[PDB]
Each structure stands twice: as structure tokens, then as C-alpha cells.
Amino acid sequence: TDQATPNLPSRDFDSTAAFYERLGFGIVFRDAGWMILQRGDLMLEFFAHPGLDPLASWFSCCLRLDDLAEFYRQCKSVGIQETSSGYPRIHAPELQEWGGTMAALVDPDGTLLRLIQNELLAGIS
């Protein structure tokens, strides 16, 4: 499978990786500039960026999941709070403007993960 990857920010490498490996994303490659965190079919490529403000962090990527209730119940049960103010933070599955439903995930760095439900997905905006 020929594949297009999201390239995302990490300030310290054990600090960013331990949040994602609780959510199933295992450490398949690690050097010092680049870190690939991968849950089965879901590849996330995290580059070393210690000069980062989490408020100015323009880095989003969608997780296109065949159920959305498994991975959102996983986030609440492992230890990630549902909150308007905070980082890390999560927001619930909603209805909006195209065909089905979407939710949200933010990490310790400021990375905007958009969570969906597969075709089935159709994610009203």
C-alpha cells in the first residue's frame, strides 16, 4: 500500500510517545530527529520541534476509524480529560454540515487529531 503520512511536532520524545503508546501507537522507529508512532494501520510521524508554542501550533491530522465509540471510550478510560480549557484535551462525537459524525483529540504538544467513523465516516462539517 502506497501511503501519504501526517508530519507532526514533538518537544521531548519519551514525553510525546508515552501519551500515544497508551492509545495503541507503538514505537516502530526512533533516532533523535524523527519518531514514527503506529497503531496497526494508523501511521503518525513526529519530528523533533522544542521551539514550539502549543497555542500557535497549526498541525492537524484525521484518524479514519471503522468504529468511533472504541477509540473515544479508550481516551476516557486510559486517562485523557474531556475539557474546554486544557492540553491534553478531548471533545465528543457531533452533527454539523455533510453526512454522518466527528470527534476531537489534543496532546501535550498541541496536535489536532480529528476522529471519524468509516464510510459510515461521513462527518457533518
Place this chain on the structure above:
Amino acid sequence: TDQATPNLPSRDFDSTAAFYERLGFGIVFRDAGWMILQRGDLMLEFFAHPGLDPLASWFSCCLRLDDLAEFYRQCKSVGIQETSSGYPRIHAPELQEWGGTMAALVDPDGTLLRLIQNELLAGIS
């Protein structure tokens, strides 16, 4: 297939899309806020961003190709110049301190597409 996607900037929608549909990435979805440009398995999600400087554009994504010679010969033959100063621009397949070889692709917006030749641990997600 469950899949993690790169979310990328587009100023005008026919202006960004016509560059990528020359490179095989057909218009599978289009509304007004979001535009999905996809070469088979290679999904690129382009959101509407007209307040963009191309010099300050921090948006990279890797195309993981099992041959790199087809898609770099495609860029030179369809009409994309190999140049140090310019946008759109391309840079050649150079040898890398990690595995194999990586070339560059920049569009009219300022989107950094990292063109990888894949190695012996080909972990298909």
C-alpha cells in the same frame, strides 16, 4: 483500511487541485471548506486557507513510494521546475543518513511533500 491523513493548506480550490490532478491525485470530494485529492491509496486533505504566507507555511507530509523514479520523472515531464529559488519547486533523489533516498516537492501554496524510497522493513499499515 483504517488511515491517518495529512491536513494541508489551499488558497483557491481550482488553483491548488489542477497542479495535483496532473500528478495523478483526482478530486474524490469537494464542497467549499474541505477538498480531498487522492491517487488510489495516497490521500491528501486540502482545507480552505486564503490567509497564508508561503514562506511561513509549516505543513509537511511524506509520500512513501516503493519506486521513487516514476513520480520524480512524472514531476519533470508534466511541468514542474527543478530550482533552489521558486514555488512550485522540486529537488532530486539524494542518499540519506537513516535508510535509502528522499526527494522534495513544493506546490503554489507552500506545502512540503517529502518523497521517500521505502527500505527493507516495509511495514504496510
